[PDB]
Amino acid sequence: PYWLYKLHGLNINYNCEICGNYTYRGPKAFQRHFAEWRHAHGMRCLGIPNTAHFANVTQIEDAVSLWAKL
Amino acid sequence: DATVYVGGLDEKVSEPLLWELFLQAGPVVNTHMPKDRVTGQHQGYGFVEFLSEEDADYAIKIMNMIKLYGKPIRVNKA
């Protein structure tokens, strides 16, 4: 249905540069997949620990700067 | 490297029960249990991600003789 995809915020293109520039079809879906195993496995390659400060981190350079600042 | 796959578990086992079983060999950072949302039952497998790869390898090598509800639970590297 188009109404359930328009009211819940679906069918909206979002780019995540951390996990190899993956695509996400929802802000809440991206927020749920941020605290998941795929985002943790993508962030473990750069050397950043899985914490609460890198929840809204998308770019690799911003996450590296946030890891180096702490 | 830090995630170990545990199989051979019954459907009656729960995720806090699996966490308390896995905490006897080492602190697990995360535990994921794939289950079908249509029926509400587990698939008999899980993934325990620890804080390091050596602790996960020790938990996989030390849980080779674990029996839950009469069924032997196997631990492998993933």
Binding site: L66 | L17, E20, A25, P27, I62, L68
Partner: protein
């Protein structure tokens, strides 16, 4: 004008309280300072939903009431259930005939027993702190364990009777712990039979 989440996380001293919706407000620094305060309470998660925090538990089953021990120890609940069972079997003529000539003495249990239950047998309920807020799934999230100790349910599922003798009361994974050594994730963990005395440490584990 509106900065991103990375600049708001790098400028604030506590980037863990920064969210994605706080970057498009009228004061990101003031919101980051108020959210990372000492005694501040966070906003509820139902402010961005679309069900008004009351349309989630529609078809879920719920118990009618949970009576405490001080109210159930007075015998009023069984008498009320018996009166509700006796009143449900009466017809309209039996209900109309009891209104002109009623039968006194319905239960007539006691008069000081309720005062003794409300004054002498008063029990304090399980309260909570002011910071622990309530949500829709807070009543169902009850999963929120220690190394070296096992519960009764895990011991019944694994088939390990807990006893003072350390012969069979440790699990059979202790043979691998004796062959390979102590776990590297817990250096202070002491198990009986390997690094602890067996009749002394009868708890099958100690974190010292």
């Amino acid at each position: 004008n509106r900065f991103t989440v990375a600049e708001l996380k790098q400028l604030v001293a506590r980037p863990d309280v920064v969210e994605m919706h706080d970057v498009t407000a009228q004061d990101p620094k003031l919101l980051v300072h108020l959210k990372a305060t000492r005694n501040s309470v966070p906003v509820p998660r139902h402010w961005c939903f679309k069900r008004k925090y009351l349309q989630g538990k529609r078809g879920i089953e719920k118990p009618p009431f949970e009576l405490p021990d001080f109210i159930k120890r007075t015998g009023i609940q069984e008498m009320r259930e018996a009166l509700q069972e006796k009143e449900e079997q009466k017809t309209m003529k039996s209900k109309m005939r009891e209104k002109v000539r009623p039968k006194m003495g319905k239960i007539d249990i006691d008069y000081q027993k309720l005062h003794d239950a409300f004054f002498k047998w008063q029990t304090k309920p399980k309260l909570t702190i002011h910071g622990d807020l309530y949500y829709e799934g807070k009543e169902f999230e009850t999963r929120l364990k220690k190394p070296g100790d096992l519960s009764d349910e895990l011991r019944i599922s694994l088939g390990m009777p807990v006893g003072p003798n350390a012969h069979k009361v440790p699990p059979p994974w202790l043979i691998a712990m004796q062959r390979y050594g102590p776990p590297p994730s817990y250096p202070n963990l002491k198990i009986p039979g390997l690094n602890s005395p067996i009749p002394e440490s009868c708890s099958f584990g100690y974190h010292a």
